[PDB]
Design a protein around this motif. Structure first.
Motif, PDB file in Angstrom:
ATOM      1  N   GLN A  73       0.848  -1.183   0.000  1.00 43.67           N
ATOM      2  CA  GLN A  73       0.000   0.000   0.000  1.00 43.67           C
ATOM      3  C   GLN A  73       0.892   1.244   0.000  1.00 43.67           C
ATOM      4  O   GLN A  73       2.084   1.103   0.284  1.00 43.67           O
ATOM      5  CB  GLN A  73      -0.913   0.046   1.227  1.00 43.67           C
ATOM      6  N   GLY A  74       0.301   2.401  -0.265  1.00 44.14           N
ATOM      7  CA  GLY A  74       1.035   3.639  -0.032  1.00 44.14           C
ATOM      8  C   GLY A  74       1.341   4.383  -1.318  1.00 44.14           C
ATOM      9  O   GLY A  74       1.782   5.540  -1.253  1.00 44.14           O
ATOM     10  N   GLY A  75       1.112   3.735  -2.454  1.00 47.45           N
ATOM     11  CA  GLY A  75       1.357   4.430  -3.714  1.00 47.45           C
ATOM     12  C   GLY A  75       2.844   4.495  -4.051  1.00 47.45           C
ATOM     13  O   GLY A  75       3.724   4.108  -3.281  1.00 47.45           O
ATOM     14  N   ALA A  76       3.105   5.008  -5.264  1.00 47.89           N
ATOM     15  CA  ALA A  76       4.511   5.174  -5.663  1.00 47.89           C
ATOM     16  C   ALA A  76       5.194   6.137  -4.716  1.00 47.89           C
ATOM     17  O   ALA A  76       6.385   6.063  -4.398  1.00 47.89           O
ATOM     18  CB  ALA A  76       4.570   5.662  -7.108  1.00 47.89           C
ATOM     19  N   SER A  77       4.390   7.087  -4.249  1.00 47.76           N
ATOM     20  CA  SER A  77       4.932   8.113  -3.361  1.00 47.76           C
ATOM     21  C   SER A  77       5.560   7.504  -2.128  1.00 47.76           C
ATOM     22  O   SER A  77       6.618   7.978  -1.700  1.00 47.76           O
ATOM     23  CB  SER A  77       3.866   9.135  -2.953  1.00 47.76           C
ATOM     24  N   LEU A  78       4.957   6.465  -1.558  1.00 49.01           N
ATOM     25  CA  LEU A  78       5.590   5.843  -0.402  1.00 49.01           C
ATOM     26  C   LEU A  78       6.908   5.168  -0.809  1.00 49.01           C
ATOM     27  O   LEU A  78       7.848   5.110  -0.017  1.00 49.01           O
ATOM     28  CB  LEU A  78       4.687   4.806   0.280  1.00 49.01           C
ATOM     29  N   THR A  81      10.216   7.134  -0.450  1.00 46.19           N
ATOM     30  CA  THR A  81      10.980   7.138   0.805  1.00 46.19           C
ATOM     31  C   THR A  81      11.383   5.728   1.191  1.00 46.19           C
ATOM     32  O   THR A  81      12.483   5.508   1.702  1.00 46.19           O
ATOM     33  CB  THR A  81      10.213   7.851   1.919  1.00 46.19           C
ATOM     34  N   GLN A 195      -2.625   2.339 -10.471  1.00 37.14           N
ATOM     35  CA  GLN A 195      -3.746   3.102 -10.995  1.00 37.14           C
ATOM     36  C   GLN A 195      -3.459   3.766 -12.330  1.00 37.14           C
ATOM     37  O   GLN A 195      -4.332   4.426 -12.891  1.00 37.14           O
ATOM     38  CB  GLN A 195      -4.198   4.202 -10.027  1.00 37.14           C
ATOM     39  N   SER A 201      -6.452   2.084  -7.959  1.00 34.53           N
ATOM     40  CA  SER A 201      -5.609   2.722  -6.956  1.00 34.53           C
ATOM     41  C   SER A 201      -5.586   1.888  -5.690  1.00 34.53           C
ATOM     42  O   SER A 201      -6.490   1.066  -5.509  1.00 34.53           O
ATOM     43  CB  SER A 201      -6.194   4.108  -6.606  1.00 34.53           C
ATOM     44  N   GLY A 202      -4.599   2.059  -4.817  1.00 32.78           N
ATOM     45  CA  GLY A 202      -4.661   1.330  -3.567  1.00 32.78           C
ATOM     46  C   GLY A 202      -3.666   0.196  -3.465  1.00 32.78           C
ATOM     47  O   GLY A 202      -3.427  -0.339  -2.374  1.00 32.78           O
ATOM     48  N   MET A 223       7.009  -2.148   8.956  1.00 30.92           N
ATOM     49  CA  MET A 223       6.178  -1.989   7.768  1.00 30.92           C
ATOM     50  C   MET A 223       6.973  -1.372   6.625  1.00 30.92           C
ATOM     51  O   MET A 223       6.550  -1.530   5.468  1.00 30.92           O
ATOM     52  CB  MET A 223       4.946  -1.118   8.053  1.00 30.92           C
ATOM     53  N   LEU A 224       8.082  -0.695   6.935  1.00 34.59           N
ATOM     54  CA  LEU A 224       8.825   0.039   5.913  1.00 34.59           C
ATOM     55  C   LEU A 224      10.062  -0.733   5.460  1.00 34.59           C
ATOM     56  O   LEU A 224      10.844  -0.189   4.670  1.00 34.59           O
ATOM     57  CB  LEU A 224       9.232   1.436   6.398  1.00 34.59           C
ATOM     58  N   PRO A 239      -3.697  -7.023   3.227  1.00 31.97           N
ATOM     59  CA  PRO A 239      -3.481  -6.386   1.913  1.00 31.97           C
ATOM     60  C   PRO A 239      -4.746  -5.729   1.374  1.00 31.97           C
ATOM     61  O   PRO A 239      -5.894  -5.924   1.817  1.00 31.97           O
ATOM     62  CB  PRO A 239      -3.085  -7.561   1.004  1.00 31.97           C
ATOM     63  N   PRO A 240      -4.549  -4.889   0.359  1.00 27.66           N
ATOM     64  CA  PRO A 240      -5.698  -4.311  -0.330  1.00 27.66           C
ATOM     65  C   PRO A 240      -6.296  -5.361  -1.263  1.00 27.66           C
ATOM     66  O   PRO A 240      -5.990  -5.440  -2.462  1.00 27.66           O
ATOM     67  CB  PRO A 240      -5.078  -3.131  -1.087  1.00 27.66           C
TER      68      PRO A 240
END
Ligand SMILES: *Cc1c(COP(=O)(O)O)cnc(C)c1O
Ligand SMILES: *Cc1c(COP(=O)(O)O)cnc(C)c1O
Ligand SMILES: [Cl-]
Ligand SMILES: [Cl-]
Ligand SMILES: [Cl-]
Ligand SMILES: [Cl-]
Ligand SMILES: [Mg+2]
Ligand SMILES: [Mg+2]
Ligand SMILES: [Mg+2]
Ligand SMILES: [Mg+2]
Lengths: 360, 356
Positions: A73-78, A81, A195, A201-202, A223-224, A239-240
């Motif tokens: 989860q978290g998108g490419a944006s996650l 980082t 997405q 998305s998700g 989690m990271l 999971p999603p």
């Protein structure tokens, strides 16, 4: 009813059969009398879906056995980082090739966490091209080299990928993953929010070389850590499930149409319809990208001034076109033509463009 | 073709919400696109996004000085995001341990800073909620964290402590919006949607705004999401759409007090069955701490346990196996689990006892 043409940039058009399939079984999946959304992710019905989505991806991109497919989860944006959190260790450098705004966002997050470098950039000329690989400034202590395969906002795209042997090659492929064949072993890791070209998305698909990242990184939240998710097969926490299910359904559709190679043929054809329209417009439409770098996924252009830009976009919206406004940061127009956008939508857009021009 | 969905997470959802989703899956709001095919910056999506927040605000009566966030990563990511944002140097993340989920949250905080255990019923295998008069609090607590409903152990806070030295923070994953709440007691509340509110994929975070940051990654700052109204990056649009739908169903049945009445009847059916069973079924929780959301129990021995769960499965019940860490049985009766399913369970329990 009236026509709708879906050029949305993210989330985006899905292939109808994936949606029709989801709709038909939404209340009773795999004869369980439950929605896939109502199942345990430990159920056999769910695990089948989760495994199939992985196997379809593996087959479709021909991912090697020493790579694992994560659904996060978290998108490419996650991932911007998470990547430096796992690989950008002390003494090492997060080396970035800048070819648009998404590359800058990735860089910024690594800057929070360690030493960064810019291997090459076309920022000076407003990201109209992909830099020559010979211009790449590489460092012996690079933790990785990070690229953006398709620059969603600027409409440019890597035609091919550099050979890198001193560090892993990492790529944000959010807006062109599985739009064409890929030599996955060129990379240490590939990631993509689903997405844009893979469904809903998700969920974020992360294809990772297992040995680059299956080891515990001291001081990183559970989690990271990639290791967490590799070890638990992306089932560490919940999971999603509907997103992964829809991803499965979309992958099945890609396979059904002949896979990456066939979808590339389709994507080249749709893109050609629009670029030829630009190129035969005698400057009425001006594409942002240099020709050698034109994206097959996001076609960016401007009319000769902002007033014509606005009238064109207002006329499109009145005629049923959705999503053509350029990204807020750059203005102009952006026709997103991901895998599932149908070719007759592209033909429709060409018709719009020609009549607008003729009548301007 | 009878099926009774006692899944513990993800879980049963309201039939009207799923039927509504099915009906418009291909053509949302006359746009001729799925909700899944819309841009998150579209007005079409933005109205759904806001409607989901609005319904939560109404249904939980969330004051204006709280913001409602829709994040990805599950309650598990909150376990680290919370101390990442609030566990500043020289402060302490103080935890009340009332089950294994409590333990998992405390573990993430230990990575990032000083921690402390205000109270714990672990010694007695988490059969109860500790007396608030028992809490050991610190002047420099960054927060006091609790787990409102201990999903694996079947215990639940009856009420919440009056904490004024530091924000009260609650993992309400398995009981959020199952009953009325006084949101002003808390500085933050969080919950994966997938038990009482919607499908998995979205996490609801209700946060006192002024409460919550140099060097934290952009995506891991609450401020990022508060500032951008949970539209900083692409949200889980379909999950938030489904969350809206579930919230409309809860509103339609009469809101938080109404769903509490249903939930108390559901729990009453099972606990009465257990209590009237003369020791054939034994509940894990002390009476005073019994959860209304997860009912945990065992038969007199492991073999009867197993015979019961097998019979259950054959009879269409899904999810009743206890958590692997504790075994036994667990009947999850979150909001959308219907009363008729609990009645069916009762009747199975009684027949099984008679036939043993
Ligand atoms: C859409 C996009 C992103 C953002 O993805 P999120 O899931 O919204 O975080 C990142 N990189 C690229 C190239 C994108 O096109
Ligand atoms: C389900 C649950 C979690 C786990 O949530 P994820 O979304 O899987 O991270 C955490 N805390 C409690 C109390 C839960 O019941
Ligand atoms: Cl870009
Ligand atoms: Cl974009
Ligand atoms: Cl628990
Ligand atoms: Cl659980
Ligand atoms: Mg097929
Ligand atoms: Mg057609
Ligand atoms: Mg209503
Ligand atoms: Mg009685």
């Amino acid at each position: 009813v009236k026509q709708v043409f879906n050029f949305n940039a993210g989330p985006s058009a899905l292939p109808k059969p994936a949606l029709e399939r989801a709709q038909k079984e939404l209340l009773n999946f795999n004869d369980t009398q439950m929605s896939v959304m109502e199942l345990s992710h430990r159920s056999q019905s769910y695990e089948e879906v989760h495994e199939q989505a992985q196997n379809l991806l593996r087959e479709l991109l021909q991912i090697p056995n020493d790579y694992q497919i994560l659904f996060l989860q978290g998108g490419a944006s996650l991932q911007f980082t998470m990547l430096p959190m796992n690989l950008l260790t002390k003494g090492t450098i997060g080396n970035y090739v800048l070819t648009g705004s998404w590359s800058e966002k990735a860089l910024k997050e690594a800057k929070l966490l360690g030493e960064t470098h810019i291997a090459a950039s076309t920022k000076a000329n407003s990201y109209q091209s992909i830099p020559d690989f010979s211009e790449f400034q590489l460092n012996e202590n690079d933790a990785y080299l990070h690229i953006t395969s398709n620059n969603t906002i600027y409409g440019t795209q890597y035609q091919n990928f550099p050979e890198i042997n001193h560090a892993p090659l990492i790529a944000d492929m959010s807006s062109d993953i599985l739009s064409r064949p890929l030599k996955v072993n060129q990379f240490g890791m590939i990631y993509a929010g689903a997405q844009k070209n893979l469904g809903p998305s998700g969920v974020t698909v992360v294809i990772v070389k297992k040995d680059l990242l299956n080891t515990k990184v001291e001081q990183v939240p559970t989690m990271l850590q990639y290791a967490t998710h590799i070890k638990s097969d992306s089932l560490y926490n919940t999971p999603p499930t509907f997103s992964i299910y829809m991803l499965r359904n979309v992958l099945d559709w890609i396979k059904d149409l002949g896979g990456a190679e066939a979808i590339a043929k389709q994507n080249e054809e749709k893109a050609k319809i629009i670029y030829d329209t630009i190129d035969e417009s005698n400057g009425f439409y001006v594409g942002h990208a240099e020709k050698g770098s034109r994206s097959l996924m996001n076609v960016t252009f401007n009319l000769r001034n902002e007033e014509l830009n606005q009238q064109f976009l207002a006329k499109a919206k009145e005629q049923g076109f959705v999503g053509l406004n350029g990204h807020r940061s750059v203005g102009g127009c952006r026709a997103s033509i991901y895998n599932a956008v149908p070719i007759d939508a592209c033909i429709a857009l060409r018709e719009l463009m020609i009549q607008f021009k003729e009548n301007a």
